[PDB]
Design a protein around this ligand. Structure first.
Ligand code: SF4
Ligand code: SF4
Ligand code: FES
Ligand code: FES
Lengths: 633, 633
């Protein structure tokens, strides 16, 4: 089970699933081998009914699509659609939050409100929305209207791109025509241009893809902005992670998905429901997190993270998961089937994300508390049905210090320099105590022993004094292996990095360092890392492609992660991907994405499936940036 | 060559391409056999990097996707993305026209103007835009703004759906939540909900698809509306079709693609350029049409149609095609490669549709006449390079009577009943002279001997007195085989249909009948058939799913045709498709699309690959509707 997951709690549940005959994601993967090499390489096209077309990577015919589409066209078109799908997910999430804020300040959903008034005003100012003499509800209405306006063409480009990157970076992108005109506009233009008999030039196709990835970035940043306004900006929190956060004697309720519009409500209402749970024989309601919705309520409320990504079925295999409350994205639909064996009540809540066999609750912001109570009462009913039964919760968990929003990081740094908070960070980059910054983002992927790439790469970078930040299930992987426990700083961090983490932590009164890795939140909260990197670029007076900052999607799977990797490249970062993307079927496409895009945006992809090698390549990229700034390395 | 195309001119060019060693679409098809059965059946998923996943249609594992996605989920998700891509193409076309109208009436592009003032006012009235006391330029500005507004969420649903279907049909659709909220909004929601770990219920997925297909219908209808305003509503015209419309001694210029924003300009400017062409040694400039842009200028100007769809390479094989001017959609990118052998200058004009090796001209409405002159001068240069050379233009063409916009059809009927023009049509439906109406739409497809399904089905329906209307390359197939020549009415039409066609034609002064098939225009002009069917429904006081009206996508290929077929089903029509769509891998999906959707919208798909059988099934569907209205059959 060690070849499936490096997580010991997951291994224990895989043994339980095996002896109970419950098929897992790893079993379904084994049943799929060998996988199709045309698809793996990207040399397959089904964009019209003359297809499917395939191209042999090497050898004899077929060498070209039926319509004449070349390998480079087919590969670039498929990649573009993946970027568009990723953009559609992040921006649907943001769109939902924009409508929630609008309803809240028009008096249509009293369960929602402006919780972070300071963030509201800063966003409005960044957007050019006047605040002086205005009511908060009017400013927020204007912010929500501006958010919804960025989805379509208008007098301005997408402001959640042009107002969040430095002017020098926006100029570079505008010169190549890469600034999105509208978020859903770009998604649709990708689907048009990649349909049959349309765009058939790999360079033109990929430039369209870069622009669509900036539409995804805008969705991410808008999602983070709006959730912070509605639910509060994260500040440092201490909690726990892994399956041992389930409690046999409590009603265990997992929030799972990405959009916390309901799950933030679930957290608040579950406290109100405690006595009702106690009357049922439980100690209380134990809300735990799965995937990015779990990250959202971990960041803001300290809700412990149960598990992530590829191993999400294992939470149910314990026998103690009374309910799993789903919104959308990255939910394995197997959970609906597994629930018949484990007793878990799986509940969908969003109209456009239903799973055959799961109970659906039609959540509406107008009825959010009432929906939450209906959902939690199903969970309490489920706990009663297992009162007495034996469960197997692995007694395995880690300590997690998290909640490092960019505002929180700036505040923490401000204890070392009040009026120039970025300077202590840059000082230590310059003097070598901090070699560079690496963002770990993205998913787990069944092809990769779970967490192996994230932890192998992270260990090597931390020893070389790289400041490591993490989001999504990359944060999940590192959190479950102790990388967010400050007690592991001595073991994990090089001397220079340790000195910096200790100095900042002691100055924030902690008596100990910051954790080895800074948890910056959910997948949309990759936008927080952009905010930090852009602030560093502005403070240094350089563009992002001169900073010693890299990204690693070390184990990625979702189309959303393809979009994020592409916009990391587009804003200027060396961007590692640790699984094979479907580009190896076209050498020209691969050369554009890993080499010649350097000449356009300054960023580039680093495809490397071996984690030790990937870490060396990421260190080389960081050290090249150091050399270009004239620094020692 | 008879197994490749039933078009004798295409057969002659296939012989020329064969002996000259020029690879064709049919050769590339042969090189692709056998095609992938997982893709053919829809049982393949590449929506995340854990893939590709496939499911054996029958037998042992794999039986399920790695994430747990079932065959029915995988099939429905792939279908939904095809609908979204189709919607993105038709609505990008419409969006382009909306921006062109806006620029024109704001004084930004003097080559464009309000040509059909009557259509402008009727559209405005249908939209609720006040016209009394308003300048035309202000009304048109309001119309263009309303068009662009339908792409995003707003206070109203998509008006190019809700204002173009009868209230009873809109009520049926609203009751099932099928009315689109915004065109690009729906496209993005499809891409989100079909991404990994999102919607996983086949019924929910397909209902989303029906709603997205209505977004495609809105794009089609908006495209037709705006092009009519800008370029004029079609009225009956006489021209010719097939390769024999090329002229060895003229500069032959093909307009190819879908959006006639530039090609309508090409038509006007080419007349201005005649003396320049003559000075080069040509008789003049011979503009001819390929695919739907050719249909647009055929409908409005009588430009002869050179060829269509699968056989588009053959126009170049003549040796006489000096230029091929491309916008986007359904252009085989092989043309850029074939051009190196044939001498043709292939020119792209749209930023998001480029082809490696083709010359690009950056068309802009602001510079439209100047761009047109640059393009035509490349064509004249190309004619000079072949002055003297031998060409092989098959001396094969047909007579084509076309231009039957819905306004033209109503006008023609008004000569038999001035104040109630639909009544003579309904009278003859009721008394049996017209058994029903069949719309032929969609593409050719290399899997089907070119035009075989369109003509086989059309012959059987016409003998049974069905009124046949046609668009796109279905109109192209029928036009090239003589179905738009009134001289073939006696041979092709049953006695009742002949009587009606003769009566209408004689009353319009023709001295002979209307043609056997009524050409209603381009693929977006499928919206014209909706306008006619909706007017018939309103006049009869029934919903569309009670009319004896059917549709046949007899040889379809493009994602656009998948979207059109789906919205034909969604507005209530029995809808035949004559190629295998990737749904046969899921019996539940197939049952929804061919049977249970009857209970939702009243329409349904008829999948039938054998054309004789398809015609019987379409006749049965028409006759069932007749019986439901109490009519003899
Ligand atoms: S678009 Fe071209 S390559 Fe793709 S399936 Fe159709 S014919 Fe084949
Ligand atoms: S979304 Fe599911 S079925 Fe599709 S490729 Fe990913 S794991 Fe396989
Ligand atoms: S041939 Fe396997 S992915 Fe298409
Ligand atoms: S396995 Fe052939 S289409 Fe994917």
């Amino acid at each position: 089970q060690n070849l499936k997951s490096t997580d010991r709690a997951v291994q224990q549940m895989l043994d339980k699933a095996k002896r109970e005959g419950i098929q897992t994601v790893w079993d379904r993967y084994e049943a799929m081998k060998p996988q199709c090499g045309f698809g793996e390489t990207g040399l397959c096209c089904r964009h019209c009914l003359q297809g499917p077309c395939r191209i042999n990577p090497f050898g004899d015919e077929p060498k070209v699509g039926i319509c004449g589409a070349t390998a480079e066209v087919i590969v670039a078109r498929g990649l573009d659609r993946s970027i568009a799908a990723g953009a559609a997910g992040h921006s649907g999430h943001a769109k939902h939050l924009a409508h929630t804020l609008k309803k809240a300040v028009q008096g249509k959903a009293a369960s929602y409100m402006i919780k972070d008034r300071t963030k509201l005003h800063s966003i409005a100012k960044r957007l050019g929305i006047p605040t002086e003499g205005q009511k908060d509800e009017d400013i927020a209405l204007e912010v929500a209207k501006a958010a919804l306006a960025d989805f379509h063409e208008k007098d301005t480009p997408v402001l959640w791109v042009t107002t969040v990157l430095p002017p020098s970076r926006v100029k570079v992108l505008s010169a190549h025509g890469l600034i999105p005109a509208g978020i859903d506009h770009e998604i649709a233009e990708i689907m048009h241009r990649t349909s049959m008999g349309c765009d058939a030039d790999a360079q033109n196709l990929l430039l369209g893809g870069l622009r669509c990835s900036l539409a995804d970035l805008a969705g991410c940043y808008m999602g983070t902005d709006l959730a912070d306004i509605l639910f509060g900006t994260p500040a440092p929190v201490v909690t726990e992670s892994n399956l041992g956060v389930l409690k046999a004697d409590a009603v265990n309720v997992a929030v799972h998905g990405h959009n916390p519009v309901l799950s933030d409500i679930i957290v608040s209402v579950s406290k109100e429901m405690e006595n009702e749970a106690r009357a049922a024989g439980a100690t209380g309601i134990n809300v735990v997190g799965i995937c990015c919705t779990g990250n959202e309520v971990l960041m803001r409320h300290g809700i412990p993270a149960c598990t992530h990504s590829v191993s999400q079925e294992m939470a149910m295999i314990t026998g103690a998961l009374d309910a799993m409350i789903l919104d959308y994205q990255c939910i394995q639909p197997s959970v609906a089937t597994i629930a018949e064996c484990t007793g878990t009540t799986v509940i969908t809540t969003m109209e456009m994300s239903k799973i055959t066999g799961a109970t659906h609750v039609n959540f509406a912001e107008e009825a959010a508390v009432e929906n939450a109570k209906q959902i939690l009462r199903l969970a309490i009913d489920t706990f009663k049905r297992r009162k007495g039964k034996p469960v197997e919760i692995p007694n395995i968990k880690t300590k997690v210090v998290a909640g490092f929003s960019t505002e929180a990081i700036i505040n923490a740094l401000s204890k070392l320099n009040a009026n120039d908070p970025l300077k202590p960070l840059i000082d230590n980059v310059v003097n070598g105590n901090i070699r560079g910054v690496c963002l770990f983002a993205g998913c787990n992927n069944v092809k990769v022993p779970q967490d192996q790439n994230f932890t192998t790469i992270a260990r090597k970078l931390l020893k070389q004094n790289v400041l490591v930040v993490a989001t999504g299930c990359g944060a999940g992987a590192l959190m479950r292996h102790g990388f967010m426990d400050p007690a592991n700083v001595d073991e994990l961090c090089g001397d220079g990095l340790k000195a910096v983490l200790t100095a900042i932590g002691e100055a924030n009164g902690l008596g100990g360092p910051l954790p080895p890795v800074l948890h910056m939140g959910s997948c949309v909260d990759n936008s927080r890392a952009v905010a930090l990197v852009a602030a560093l670029a502005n403070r240094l007076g350089v563009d992002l492609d001169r900073l010693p900052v890299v990204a690693s999607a070390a184990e990625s799977m979702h189309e959303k992660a393809v979009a994020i990797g592409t916009w990391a490249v587009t804003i200027g970062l060396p961007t590692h991907i640790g699984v094979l993307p479907p580009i190896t079927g076209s050498l020209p496409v691969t050369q554009i994405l890993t080499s010649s895009v350097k000449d356009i945006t300054g960023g580039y992809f680093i495809v490397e499936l071996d984690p030790e090698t990937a870490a060396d390549k990421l260190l080389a990229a960081i050290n090249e940036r150091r050399a270009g700034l004239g620094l020692p390395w």
